[PDB]
Amino acid sequence: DGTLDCISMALTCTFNRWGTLLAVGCNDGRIVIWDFLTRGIAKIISAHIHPVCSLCWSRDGHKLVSASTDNIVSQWDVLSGDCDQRFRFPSPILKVQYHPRDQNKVLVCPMKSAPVMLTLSDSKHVVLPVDDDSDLNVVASFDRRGEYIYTGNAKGKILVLKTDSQDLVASFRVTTGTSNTTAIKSIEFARKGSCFLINTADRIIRVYDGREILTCGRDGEPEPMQKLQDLVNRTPWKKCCFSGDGEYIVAGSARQHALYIWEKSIGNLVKILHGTRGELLLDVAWHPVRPIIASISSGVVSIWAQNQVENWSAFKELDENVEYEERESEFDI
Amino acid sequence: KVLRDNIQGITKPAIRRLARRGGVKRISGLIYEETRGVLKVFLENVIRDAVTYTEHAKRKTVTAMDVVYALKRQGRTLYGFG
Amino acid sequence: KPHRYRPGTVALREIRRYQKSTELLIRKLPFQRLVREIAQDFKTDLRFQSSAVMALQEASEAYLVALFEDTNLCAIHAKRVTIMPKDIQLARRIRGER
Amino acid sequence: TRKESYAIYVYKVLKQVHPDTGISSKAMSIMNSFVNDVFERIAGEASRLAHYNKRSTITSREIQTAVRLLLPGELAKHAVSEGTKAVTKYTSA
DNA sequence: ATCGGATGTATATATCTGACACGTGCCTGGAGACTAGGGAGTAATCCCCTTGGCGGTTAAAACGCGGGGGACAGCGCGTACGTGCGTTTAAGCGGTGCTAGAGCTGTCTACGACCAATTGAGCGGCCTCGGCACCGGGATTCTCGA
DNA sequence: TCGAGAATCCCGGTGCCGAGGCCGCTCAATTGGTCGTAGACAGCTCTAGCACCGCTTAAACGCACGTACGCGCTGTCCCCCGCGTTTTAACCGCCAAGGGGATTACTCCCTAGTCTCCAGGCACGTGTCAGATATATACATCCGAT
């Protein structure tokens, strides 16, 4: 539905705060900041020699946190492209995430170690707690306002901490239905409201409302707002995301390189988008204020927009025949 | 501990294994879930009736003799359980 | 050059060995979870005998192979080696299961 | 708890027919359940026919008639003859 | 795709009636009242099976992947089957008549019922050990390309 | 179609726990009176069955014949079999907690059993209309020409 030839080795992308720019990582380890309106590249940053697998914009949009595969995280000013700060860790980093309401702070999910929240002003770090002490794979994310931290382990356990004190404000373990746990693949939140989603190893996305987890307390049984899956193919989900408003949810079937689109309230599947059967789906993102969806597959990015009835359909356009309502004086002088 | 969707826990390999035991060569996909349904429906009765026994048994655990008398009442009696 | 047996042949031998074997062909735990799921529908938190659930699964699988058997037979009368859902439905129909 | 069964008599009649054979306790339980099944069957049928005959006394004639109702052909014939011989033997003393 | 004609079917009508609603006198099962035992209900105790979890394995399931194999659609023909009309035929009404056998009552008696006294056949429990299950390995035979 | 290869059969050997045998330890089987009674049996009805026979006729058998579904064959598609790989969770083994299941001991509420009396039910008459039946009629629907 529209691709870009000007970028190669697309690996990970991230919309800015207003959905005007897109920073995509490349295998060479370069940042390609490409613009939507001019439909061209806005910037090229020599980030790492190692490909970049995690990228996040700052709220003001002037900072981008990038993670190399060399366990090298670095902050870059979008105007200049300089490495503002640079750090390295053990247990290679799985993800970075700016704090949405404090760009000085940034959480980092490493591979084998617990996620740690650092600051840029001071090169300090706060290691977030781990429930089972043996997960070795815990994804973590700020909420919409950056007030709480949601951490999900490979054993389905879900901890909600407060971002400042790291104190356990809520907890619950998700189930595979019967009695078993499932590897929490990812935690996503809505940029609007409080609904969030969890991708798990059961290939079943679970949509909740964080207020219900907060009122559920520690070690409770919160039910999901929704349960979403491909009941037909039972396909895993490499990457999923909400819509900009938060009423549409998309999942990327890397198994068959497709895109499933459900709703939030009803949860019925909006639609499906099919990509090149030969392409391996890698990354998925939604335009924050547009029905536009960016996909990264086999190093190539594709764009999926959604237009209205007009752009040619605007006499007064009607859809179905209209019986004329004759009047009393319809034949009168 | 609320359970769900163990019906699909029935593997298509299991279904085709049972079919081969029944002496079947070629099978379509549309069967399995259909099969499953029937399965459910089938057991749909007995357990209830079984626990119905357990109902009158005034007990919390369910026993074999329950399903014994069920299959009996279901005209599908079984041996080897008292 | 790689060898592949003609279709059915492997499944044919599977049929032969399954009529040869007698044990169950269903994994225990999934069946048990299904049974308990069905149970909570009528009443929640009910316990069971392992003997009881073994009986459930054996008797089920027996009914199931009987259904597969006579549906195979019907499909013979349907002159096909592939099975059709309608065969199962009408079999239940003759089995008074409708 | 004193539980009653028949597996001992199963082993007995087995040796009576096959002295050099073993059984699975599973199979013994299956056979005993079968014993119970046929017993309840014949008993219910006999009581029902006696009810049809308004009889409150279930005797060997009822037994034979109900077996004939239940067993087919030579099965029934041999069973009738065997029960007849046995009751004759018991009545002989 | 329609109209016309043939035919078969739903309708109103009339009356006939024989089931059928209705009422009786007479019978006995049902109600009413009273006594006993003891099945059932409750409770405290024990056990112990179950339900729960935890970690390692892989056989098994998931999934993919050709691809020949048959499901299926179509197409010719032909034989077997509806049909309408012949034919002849037992089927049904019905009414007769005999009684063999149901179907009832009145004994009287053998026959479990039942209880009590007695106990050894049988059953829970404890060794035990050998067909049997598993395994590894060698030899046999089916099968798919010549 | 004679080999290659592959799944299988069989053989010997290993180790095991269920099959079995035996041992305490009863309660349920036996024995023997004893009693009221189920029915065995005799002996009556009467009626429903069983057969007889005639009369009418709707029904059955067969014919001819159109015809049209059954069947047989061809080619296509697709799709499910087979194999390869990758992932997983069933299983399996072990542990542990308790919560229910089963047990026993009391305790007594309810039912069986008895006796009394009668009133609802039942066999039995009795008018009587729901509907069966027949007829003419009006409507619906097929089948063939257009």
Swiss-Prot record, chain A:
Residues 323-333 have a biased composition (Acidic residues). Coiled coil: none annotated. WD repeats lie at residues 5-46, 47-86, 131-171, 179-218, 232-274, 276-314. It is found in: Nucleus. The modification Phosphothreonine is found at residue 235. Keywords: Chromatin regulator, Isopeptide bond, Nucleus, Phosphoprotein, Repeat, Transcription, Transcription regulation, Ubl conjugation, WD repeat. One of its GO terms (biological process) is DNA damage response. One of its GO terms (molecular function) is transcription cis-regulatory region binding. GO terms for cellular component: histone methyltransferase complex; MLL1 complex; MLL1/2 complex; MLL3/4 complex; nucleolus; nucleoplasm; nucleus; Set1C/COMPASS complex. Ubiquitously expressed. In embryonic stem (ES) cells, plays a crucial role in the differentiation potential, particularly along the neural lineage, regulating gene induction and H3 'Lys-4' methylation at key developmental loci, including that mediated by retinoic acid. Does not affect ES cell self-renewal. Component or associated component of some histone methyltransferase complexes which regulates transcription through recruitment of those complexes to gene promoters. As part of the MLL1/MLL complex, involved in mono-, di- and trimethylation at 'Lys-4' of histone H3. This is Retinoblastoma-binding protein 5. It comes from Homo sapiens (Human). The lineage of its organism: Eukaryota, Metazoa, Chordata, Craniata, Vertebrata. The chain holds residues 18 to 354 of 538 of the full protein.
Swiss-Prot record, chain B:
The modification N6-glutaryllysine is found at residues 12, 40, 58, 60, 72. There is a cross-link at residue 72 (Glycyl lysine isopeptide (Lys-Gly) (interchain with G-Cter in ubiquitin)). The modification N6-lactoyllysine is found at residues 12, 58, 72. The modification N6-methylated lysine is found at residue 1. GO terms for biological process: nucleosome assembly. The modification N6-butyryllysine is found at residues 12, 25, 58, 60, 72. Its main location: nucleus. It comes from the Eukaryota. Belongs to the histone H4 family. This is Histone H4.
UniProtKB/Swiss-Prot annotation, chain C:
The nucleosome is a histone octamer containing two molecules each of H2A, H2B, H3 and H4 assembled in one H3-H4 heterotetramer and two H2A-H2B heterodimers. The octamer wraps approximately 147 bp of DNA. The modification Phosphoserine is found at residues 21, 50. It comes from the Eukaryota. The modification N6-glutaryllysine is found at residues 20, 43, 79, 86. It comes from Xenopus laevis (African clawed frog). A lipid is attached at residue 74 (S-palmitoyl cysteine). Its main location: nucleus. GO terms for molecular function: DNA binding; protein heterodimerization activity; structural constituent of chromatin. The modification N6-methyllysine is found at residues 1, 20, 28, 43, 86. The keyword DNA-binding applies. The lineage of its organism: Eukaryota, Metazoa, Chordata, Craniata, Vertebrata. The modification N6-acetyllysine is found at residues 20, 43, 79, 86. The modification N6-(2-hydroxyisobutyryl)lysine is found at residues 20, 28, 43, 86. The modification N6-succinyllysine is found at residues 20, 43, 86. Acetylation is generally linked to gene activation. Acetylation at Lys-86 (H3K122ac) by EP300/p300 plays a central role in chromatin structure: localizes at the surface of the histone octamer and stimulates transcription, possibly by promoting nucleosome instability. H3R2me2a is present at the 3' of genes regardless of their transcription state and is enriched on inactive promoters, while it is absent on active promoters. This is Histone H3.2. The modification N6-lactoyllysine is found at residues 20, 43. The modification Phosphotyrosine is found at residue 5. Keywords: Acetylation, ADP-ribosylation, Chromosome, Citrullination, DNA-binding, Hydroxylation, Lipoprotein, Methylation, Nucleosome core, Nucleus, Palmitate, Phosphoprotein, Ubl conjugation. GO terms for cellular component: nucleoplasm; nucleosome. The modification N6-crotonyllysine is found at residue 20. Belongs to the histone H3 family.
UniProtKB/Swiss-Prot annotation, chain D:
Its main location: nucleus. The keyword Ion transport does not apply. Monoubiquitination of Lys-89 by BRE1 gives a specific tag for epigenetic transcriptional activation and is also prerequisite for histone H3 'Lys-4' and 'Lys-79' methylation. GlcNAcylation at Ser-81 promotes monoubiquitination of Lys-89. It fluctuates in response to extracellular glucose, and associates with transcribed genes. Glycans are attached at residue 81. It is found in: Nucleus; Chromosome. It comes from the Eukaryota. There is a cross-link at residue 89 (Glycyl lysine isopeptide (Lys-Gly) (interchain with G-Cter in ubiquitin)). The keyword DNA-binding applies. GO terms for molecular function: DNA binding; protein heterodimerization activity; structural constituent of chromatin. Keywords: Acetylation, Chromosome, DNA-binding, Glycoprotein, Isopeptide bond, Nucleosome core, Nucleus, Phosphoprotein, Ubl conjugation. GO terms for cellular component: nucleosome; nucleus. Core component of nucleosome. Nucleosomes wrap and compact DNA into chromatin, limiting DNA accessibility to the cellular machineries which require DNA as a template. Histones thereby play a central role in transcription regulation, DNA repair, DNA replication and chromosomal stability. DNA accessibility is regulated via a complex set of post-translational modifications of histones, also called histone code, and nucleosome remodeling. Belongs to the histone H2B family. This is Histone H2B 1.1.
